[PDB]
Amino acid sequence: GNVYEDTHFFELCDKYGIMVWQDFAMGCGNYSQRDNFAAALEKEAISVVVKLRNHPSLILWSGNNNDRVSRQVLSRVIYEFDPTRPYLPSSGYYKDPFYTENPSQFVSEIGYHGCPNRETLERMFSPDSVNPWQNGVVGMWNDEWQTKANRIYDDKFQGGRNDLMTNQVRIIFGEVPADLDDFIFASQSVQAEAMKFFVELWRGRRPYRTGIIWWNIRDGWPLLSDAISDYWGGKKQAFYYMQNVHHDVCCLINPAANGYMLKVDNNTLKDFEGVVEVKDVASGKQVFKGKFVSKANQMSEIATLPMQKGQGMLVISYRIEGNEYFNHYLYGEPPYKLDQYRKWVKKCGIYELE
Amino acid sequence: SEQSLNGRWTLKFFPQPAVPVMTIEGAEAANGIVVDAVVPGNVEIDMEAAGLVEDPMVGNNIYKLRPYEGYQWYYSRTFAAPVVTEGQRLVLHFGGIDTFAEVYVNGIKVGSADNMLIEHDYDITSVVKEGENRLDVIIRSSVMEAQNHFLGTLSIGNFSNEESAPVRRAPSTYGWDIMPRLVSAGLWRDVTLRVENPVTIVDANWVTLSVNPKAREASESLYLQTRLPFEMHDKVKAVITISRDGRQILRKEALMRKFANLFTLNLSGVDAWWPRGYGEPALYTAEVSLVDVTSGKIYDTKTSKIGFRTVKLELDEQFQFIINGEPVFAKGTNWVPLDALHSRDASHVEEAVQLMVEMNCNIVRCWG
Numbered sequence A: 001g002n003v004y005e006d007t008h009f010f011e012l013c014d015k016y017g018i019m020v021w022q023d024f025a026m027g028c029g030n031y032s033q034r035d036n037f038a039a040a041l042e043k044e045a046i047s048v049v050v051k052l053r054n055h056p057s058l059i060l061w062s063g064n065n066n067d068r069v070s071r072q073v074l075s076r077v078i079y080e081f082d083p084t085r086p087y088l089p090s091s092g093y094y095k096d097p098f099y100t101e102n103p104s105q106f107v108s109e110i111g112y113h114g115c116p117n118r119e120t121l122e123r124m125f126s127p128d129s130v131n132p133w134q135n136g137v138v139g140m141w142n143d144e145w146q147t148k149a150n151r152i153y154d155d156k157f158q159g160g161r162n163d164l165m166t167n168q169v170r171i172i173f174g175e176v177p178a179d180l181d182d183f184i185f186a187s188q189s190v191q192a193e194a195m196k197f198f199v200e201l202w203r204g205r206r207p208y209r210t211g212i213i214w215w216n217i218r219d220g221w222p223l224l225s226d227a228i229s230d231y232w233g234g235k236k237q238a239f240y241y242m243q244n245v246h247h248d249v250c251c252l253i254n255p256a257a258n259g260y261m262l263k264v265d266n267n268t269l270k271d272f273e274g275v276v277e278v279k280d281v282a283s284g285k286q287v288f289k290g291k292f293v294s295k296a297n298q299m300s301e302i303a304t305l306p307m308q309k310g311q312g313m314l315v316i317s318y319r320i321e322g323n324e325y326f327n328h329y330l331y332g333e334p335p336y337k338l339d340q341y342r343k344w345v346k347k348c349g350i351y352e353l354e
Numbered sequence B: 001s002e003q004s005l006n007g008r009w010t011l012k013f014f015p016q017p018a019v020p021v022m023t024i025e026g027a028e029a030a031n032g033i034v035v036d037a038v039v040p041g042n043v044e045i046d047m048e049a050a051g052l053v054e055d056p057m058v059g060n061n062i063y064k065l066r067p068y069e070g071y072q073w074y075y076s077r078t079f080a081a082p083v084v085t086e087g088q089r090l091v092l093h094f095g096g097i098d099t100f101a102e103v104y105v106n107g108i109k110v111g112s113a114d115n116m117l118i119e120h121d122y123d124i125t126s127v128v129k130e131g132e133n134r135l136d137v138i139i140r141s142s143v144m145e146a147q148n149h150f151l152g153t154l155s156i157g158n159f160s161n162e163e164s165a166p167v168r169r170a171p172s173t174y175g176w177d178i179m180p181r182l183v184s185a186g187l188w189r190d191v192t193l194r195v196e197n198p199v200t201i202v203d204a205n206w207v208t209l210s211v212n213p214k215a216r217e218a219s220e221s222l223y224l225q226t227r228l229p230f231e232m233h234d235k236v237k238a239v240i241t242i243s244r245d246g247r248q249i250l251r252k253e254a255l256m257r258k259f260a261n262l263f264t265l266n267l268s269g270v271d272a273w274w275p276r277g278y279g280e281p282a283l284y285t286a287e288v289s290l291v292d293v294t295s296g297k298i299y300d301t302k303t304s305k306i307g308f309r310t311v312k313l314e315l316d317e318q319f320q321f322i323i324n325g326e327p328v329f330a331k332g333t334n335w336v337p338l339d340a341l342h343s344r345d346a347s348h349v350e351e352a353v354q355l356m357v358e359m360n361c362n363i364v365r366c367w368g
Helices: A007-016 A035-052 A068-081 A118-124 A143-147 A163-173 A180-204 A237-243 A338-348 B024-029 B043-049 B061-070 B142-148 B342-359
Strands: A020-023 A058-062 A249-256 A259-266 A272-280 A286-294 A299-305 A312-320 A323-331 B002-004 B007-015 B033-039 B071-080 B089-094 B101-105 B108-113 B120-123 B132-139 B191-196 B200-212 B217-227 B236-244 B247-255 B260-268 B284-292 B298-306 B311-315 B319-323 B332-335 B363-366
Touching: A007 A035, A035 A068, A118 A180, A163 A180, A180 A237, A180 A249, A180 A259, A180 A338, A249 A272, A249 A299, A249 A312, A249 A323, A259 A272, A259 A286, A259 A312, A286 A299, A312 A338, A323 A338, B007 B043, B007 B061, B024 B132, B033 B043, B033 B071, B043 B061, B061 B071, B061 B142, B089 B101, B101 B120, B108 B120, B200 B284, B200 B298, B217 B236, B217 B284, B236 B260, B247 B260, B332 B342
Parallel strands: A020 A058, B332 B363
Antiparallel strands: A249 A259, A259 A299, A272 A286, A272 A312, A312 A323, B002 B191, B007 B033, B007 B071, B071 B132, B089 B120, B089 B191, B101 B108, B101 B132, B200 B217, B217 B260, B236 B247, B236 B284, B284 B298, B311 B319
8 A cells, every 4th residue: 555665665674684575556455457557557567576676675576465467467577577586466352262263374464553642642633632532521532533543534423443442442441541641551551462462472373373464563644543653753552562572582471271371482593591580560479480492493382380360460581691581461351450550560660651 | 473573682781870770861871881682692691792701601700790780781672563453452572581670662661570480561552653663671680679678587598599589580590509690681581572353362271170091081171261342242253173183183163252261171082191101191282263253264373282181189198199090109300490591491491301201200390
């Protein structure tokens, strides 16, 4: 759905080591099978392939889709002008079996809504519209908030896309907070826990899972979205959660009715050794402490932890080659209490409530 | 009748500039050298006759023809146009133009050739004059034509030259391990003038439907396409004749009520065509004529020798050729260019085919 990025984008991905999956410019929709569109698409495909085929970060071309465009036109351009890259014609509660029991080794799209920071709210909204609740009635969005969902045309309606924020908050935390700062923290926490869980679930189920591409990292307009950072650089709380489960070597915990499975995942070609400690946040009790060996490019199990009672948080501290790393795990089942989760996050000592 | 435009032409050659010469005033204005050329021919044959180049077959003289790959070649001659009756068509036939060229008749363009390997026919009925007419062909550089294209990745680095990928010429002319690099140029096959009646044969496609060699029977089909003015519908008959050494075997006449027809000939007392060893190469003269039913005037006639034979490739489930229901064992050679200057090919064909007859090859593969 975006333009093709310029050369400087790929030069940056080249030197930072970020592989690039490039979809051709077609969006959610089927397209013409006639000769005029094919010629225009062929002229476009050859131009962008010749422009980009020499970047080492570029690894895949996709049709983002019997179709002439995806199975004939675009595949014929890759066949002649870039045979060294593959071509692919086509692409609630976060612990619900729809997400958990998804049998795909490689997830290409996955996202949860997250209310932007207060500073970004006050900048894009009129002063009397910064608070989302029209007439104070919790759940009913004012017109400016309905615009930034995003409403493509100026039709006055209630509900729609923005209800995803209150629905996901109502699930995890039982009730939607009326106070704006509480609603910001609640909505960002739901996005943070949901996104962190998907990455820990995919990294924790290796070698069956082969990859995860989440949606998305940055907004291209002042908007209310499922991105983890805004157009003005405002990082939502999910950005910090996601950052701590994207390390080259990551100690994480996956759920089990038996309790907690402390694992360590390695996305390198080297073996690493460290020491990991897990303690309960509300009680301060140490649940586990010991060294580990993380084999290269594989997931290694460390230990199985005893099941704690009720709801709470475990803080994961591990040191690898003189560097301290931090992670956490929220145990129990929703609904959670918002004020209790906030204390656990502040005492975990990793993320600031801001 | 068919009037031959072969013989002595005028050849003017000069280096091709940044803007290739496409017109006549440009070809006459260009500073070049003029020589007497023989058509059919190659331009290097004409230059060697003029003492301008040395024999490329000896020593390293093949590399001395290198600069002429960037030259243009201006052919020009004068012919007498025959008097055409109302309704007839005057066709200018080129058997071989190497390669990229503009064809003019009386200062008017009649076509643009772009393929060395196929014939080029032009209708010049409306552009000819009375008496002497001027024919001009301005050929440009085949090598420089490649730079008008952007090559795909797998078109670069092959054994065939990158100059050969986007153009329709013989790939070995650019150089091979068994053929020299001698791109050359010129009218390397016959150039003739043809006068066609309003009623003429466009194509006569002979096809063997079935063959019973032991019964000496065969079923031949004739897919005939003609030019037929509507006032000539129901007034022309097609005369089909199958003969051997003069003896007539079958004669079928049918009224032409439409321009295209299929005539099926169920023949008896005819021998099947076989490859060497497996039997005789029995050939029969097949002649089709378009005859007026009233005046008896013959408007056109096509004649060729056809063979009654079936061919099936059995892919083993690594293949075997099946000729007339029999599995033949193929033994033969690959057929490569007879000459780097391909206008001399026709002078080698008879003697080179005899090499395969003496070898007793039953098959030959014409190399791409």
